[PDB]
Amino acid sequence: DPMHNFTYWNPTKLIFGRGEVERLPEELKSYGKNVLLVYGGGSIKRSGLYDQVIEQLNKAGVTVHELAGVEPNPRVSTVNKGVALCKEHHIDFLLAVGGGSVIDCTKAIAAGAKYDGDAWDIVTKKHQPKDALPFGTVLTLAATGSEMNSGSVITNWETKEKYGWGSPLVFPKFSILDPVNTFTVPKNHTIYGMVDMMSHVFEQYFHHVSNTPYQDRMCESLLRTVIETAPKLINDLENYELRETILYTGTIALNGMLSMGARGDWATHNIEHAVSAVYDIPHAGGLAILFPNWMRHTLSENPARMKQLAVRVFGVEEAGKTDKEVALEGIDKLSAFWTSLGAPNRLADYDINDEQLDTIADKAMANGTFGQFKSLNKEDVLAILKASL
Amino acid sequence: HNFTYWNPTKLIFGRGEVERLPEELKSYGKNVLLVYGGGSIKRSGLYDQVIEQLNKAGVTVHELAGVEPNPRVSTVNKGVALCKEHHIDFLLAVGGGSVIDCTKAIAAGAKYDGDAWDIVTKKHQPKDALPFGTVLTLAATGSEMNSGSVITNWETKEKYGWGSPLVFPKFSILDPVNTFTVPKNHTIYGMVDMMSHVFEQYFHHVSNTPYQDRMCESLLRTVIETAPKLINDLENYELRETILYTGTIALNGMLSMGARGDWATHNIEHAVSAVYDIPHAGGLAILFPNWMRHTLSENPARMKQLAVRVFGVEEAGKTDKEVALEGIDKLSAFWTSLGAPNRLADYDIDEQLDTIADKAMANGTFGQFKSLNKEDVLAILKASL
Ligand code: NI
Ligand code: NI
Structure with missing residues (x-):
């Protein structure tokens, strides 16, 4: 299909x-x-x-x-x-x-x-x-x-x-x-920033398959650069070169140069916004928790997008495996990577339990169903929130 | 930078x-x-x-x-x-x-x-x-x-x-x-041109450009995947669409942020086309591999990275120069596989090489990856005969 x-x-x-x-x-x-x-x-x-x-x-x-x-x-x-x-x-x-x-x-x-x-x-x-x-x-x-x-x-x-x-x-x-x-x-917000720019790439990448091969590679390339740089930077926070690379990738991640011809999904961002609306947590702390579970929740819509990320970015070998198996392995490796940096992986990391999940889901749904890769309703958000506890 | x-x-x-x-x-x-x-x-x-x-x-x-x-x-x-x-x-x-x-x-x-x-x-x-x-x-x-x-x-x-x-x-x-x-010939030329523009922006000595490097390598890989299919299917929307999109990104400045390109092959090409009026990218296909060979010793690591990441060269057991030279051969073979020329003889072009070198040198020495003088361009032209 032609790009949009x-x-x-x-x-x-x-x-x-x-x-x-x-x-x-x-x-x-x-x-x-x-x-x-x-x-x-x-x-x-x-x-x-x-x-x-x-x-x-x-x-x-x-x-x-x-x-x-x-x-x-x-x-x-x-x-x-x-x-x-x-x-x-x-x-x-x-x-x-x-x-x-x-x-x-x-x-x-x-x-x-x-x-x-x-x-x-x-x-x-x-x-x-x-x-x-x-x-x-x-x-x-x-x-x-x-x-x-x-x-x-x-x-x-x-x-x-x-x-x-x-x-x-x-x-x-x-x-x-x-x-x-x-x-x-500080280290915590350095980690958050790298989670955020990676998440922006994911948001722009999760669309139905169309004729965006160069955009796909620009996205995958940004992810690989941040993955290579992040562990060195967190242990060397005053390194000019390492800060320079992450400063540069942060701009490209959301200046529009990656989203030409494709509608991003942005559902994880909307769910995160509802969590931060109630608890005021750091934006990308919520993203690190939520994004892997959104990926698991929406995989059945079309495993081919996550499969390509799993193989081109997260080093998964596909031989002998279905696309769904490859993609799930990749999601695990994304979550492992963020956790290896010190990013949170559960809502319990912010002392968030299940007391306000209904309120959070309501706030996410305030403008109706949302998401372009998959249309989400209240049950979907609720399922993603529960998996992230 | x-x-x-x-x-x-x-x-x-x-x-x-x-x-x-x-x-x-x-x-x-x-x-x-x-x-x-x-x-x-x-x-x-x-x-x-x-x-x-x-x-x-x-x-x-x-x-x-x-x-x-x-x-x-x-x-x-x-x-x-x-x-x-x-x-x-x-x-x-x-x-x-x-x-x-x-x-x-x-x-x-x-x-x-x-x-x-x-x-x-x-x-x-x-x-x-x-x-x-x-x-x-x-x-x-x-x-x-x-x-x-x-x-x-x-x-x-x-x-x-x-x-x-x-x-x-x-x-x-x-x-x-x-x-x-x-037409087929100018379709080939355009793809040679956009790839050359990427090479110009890639051959620099600025140290810390890992994402720009990958954006360049990605654009090259995309054009390489598309080009053989397009020349045999010139009214295919999808293939024309990809080449139209990469052509804009290749020289809108989104690849040259933080790095001064070399642009020497383009300056030499401009001198050739000033005398003979040949297609811009026809000259590039002839000249660029020999510029790459001529400047390799300045830093074999740049062409080596292209050879491994773009042109599928396996480096095990080879020096950086050997890997790079294999990559240059594969670039030249790829362009030739599309129908691009590979020698000045393809355009009925050594009688005017001194004039071309003079016009190329009209503004003094040039090139950022390697500073070139009249002897350098003369050698590249001769290697391209
Ligand atoms: Ni964000
Ligand atoms: Ni050009």
């Missing part, structure tokens, strides 16, 4: 290399002088990046106001605070300095700053953005690829909901990616 | 997507210059489809026909004049890489009060350009999604590449059906 008709468009300027925070003045010159600096819980102050950014913004002659304390799984209360700061200070441009939570929050602020309503209306697709403030990023954690896409995931902590939204208007104008700026990412 | 990646082109891919022209043209002006080549788009029926879409879009169409393979700068200057004559707002390139590259030179030339050859020779750096889009009819160059252009001066016998951030296509429409009528 597609449109690829990604206008983000990706700036990569050591010391490239010094590109900020040149990149800021064409935009207005009122800048909102958005950042998280303080790791950029301890790494020294905060003072470097402040120095560059001073050099750029801009008036700086700040939104500090964006939380992991950024909250819409934080977004609305940022929108208010944009209104209060008549902000022209936003600079996101942090991880995916900071970038995702900044996208929601940029769109929320052109909308006279609750920013949660944008997250829930009640209002489709027609304008947005421009923004850029300095990335401090390799994981989500948000530095080079137009998507954003926001939590409503009052309603215990976590949803992804997107807009062609909230691509970053530029993103500055220096491996040195990820050196202080 | 430090790098900057930026590519704002909207890539529109799929069957029947020429019908996207009205929506994509809506935000631009109504004076469109349609640029195309020697008439193959009329023989395919594509010309009439485009005219129908431009009529649907309500635009005033003027035409520049007859852009030649290895587009000549005289055609560019005529195109600039047509832009001034008819107050053109937007250019639509409908053809191959020659047509798109010519259209890029017209788009920039239309904002410069002088000969566009100044732009090709980098005497004038474009400060503005007209916007343009493309409908691609041949899978080869990747010009549909980059900011580069290669223009020939047929009076001086020169062929040079130039570029500008201002001449990315606004959009490019890629329908595999529009490559169905590409």
Whole structure:
């Protein structure tokens, strides 16, 4: 079957290399002088990046106001605070300095700053953005690829909901990616980032078989590179080369260069979002737990996709085995690989038992059946949740 | 390595997507210059489809026909004049890489009060350009999604590449059906070209590029799997689709992030085609294996990795140089198996090797994997006789 008709468009300027925070003045010159600096819980102050950014913004002659304390799984209360700061200070441009939570929050602020309503209306697709403030990023954690896409995931902590939204208007104008700026990412979140970029590859790879041989190999190649790099990096967290490789693969994993011509599945991500909506756990910690059990649950729909991963990525020999046997062996080896890094493999790792599984499944089903490789209903989610206990 | 990646082109891919022209043209002006080549788009029926879409879009169409393979700068200057004559707002390139590259030179030339050859020779750096889009009819160059252009001066016998951030296509429409009528020889050439572009980006000394290496090796493997089937089934949608898709990725910059390509074989090829006007990738098939052999000693590990990962060479009991040389033979055998030439004699080409070497050396020493001088290119040309 022909690949799906597609449109690829990604206008983000990706700036990569050591010391490239010094590109900020040149990149800021064409935009207005009122800048909102958005950042998280303080790791950029301890790494020294905060003072470097402040120095560059001073050099750029801009008036700086700040939104500090964006939380992991950024909250819409934080977004609305940022929108208010944009209104209060008549902000022209936003600079996101942090991880995916900071970038995702900044996208929601940029769109929320052109909308006279609750920013949660944008997250829930009640209002489709027609304008947005421009923004850029300095990335401090390799994981989500948000530095080079137009998507954003926001939590409503009052309603215990976590949803992804997107807009062609909230691509970053530029993103500055220096491996040195990820050196202080702790081991646990270094592991999470690698789980996340691998999971993004899986999401884009699990589609019905069609004429995507080069896309398949780009996906398999990214997985092999991360698998080769991850054990070395976790034991050598200040290694420039190892951080560089993972920073690079994190961007390609979700900038759209892998998803041309094929609809991703994204069901495991939606289930994970429901778990993090209730318990606030790290996104990719939930992915490491859930993805292998989604793969087991959906295998009968077509074992051929997982079989190809099992053979090309996970070293399974297929001689004398059915496709289902090969695929199941591969899923075990994926789960073993993540566990060998120290990633969690059961919900009990986050002190999550079965008390709220019905609530979590309901939240996953809030928009009806979902998934493109297999359509999932409440019984399916529930089965995947129970297997992940 | 430090790098900057930026590519704002909207890539529109799929069957029947020429019908996207009205929506994509809506935000631009109504004076469109349609640029195309020697008439193959009329023989395919594509010309009439485009005219129908431009009529649907309500635009005033003027035409520049007859852009030649290895587009000549005289055609560019005529195109600039047509832009001034008819107050053109937007250019639509409908053809191959020659047509798109010519259209890029017209788009920039239309904002410069002088000969566009100044732009090709980098005497004038474009400060503005007209916007343009493309409908691609041949899978080869990747010009549909980059900011580069290669223009020939047929009076001086020169062929040079130039570029500008201002001449990315606004959009490019890629329908595999529009490559169905590409004849066997140019189908072969396109696949040789895209593989060569991968080789150019792969032969560098930048240390830490493991994923780029695999993206390159993956593209080569995909083309190798597809090419023998396609040359015997030229109207197969699936096979044309794969080659159209890999052709764009091979030179849209998605493979060269963090690594400066070598590009020496291309510069030597450009000198050959400047004198003899042969197909770009016909020269590449002849030259590239001998460039690979000539530069092997600089670092046998690069070609060795290609030999093992792409060309199925078993390394047990062999030196890196032995593995690499086996890989080069298999690359050359593969291209020959498609019908690509393997010697300069295939194009009735040693009387003009000194001239070709001079033109290749016109900008001094070149090459990133190995720095080449006149003696080097002369040796590669002779090995290619
Ligand atoms: Ni994710
Ligand atoms: Ni080429």
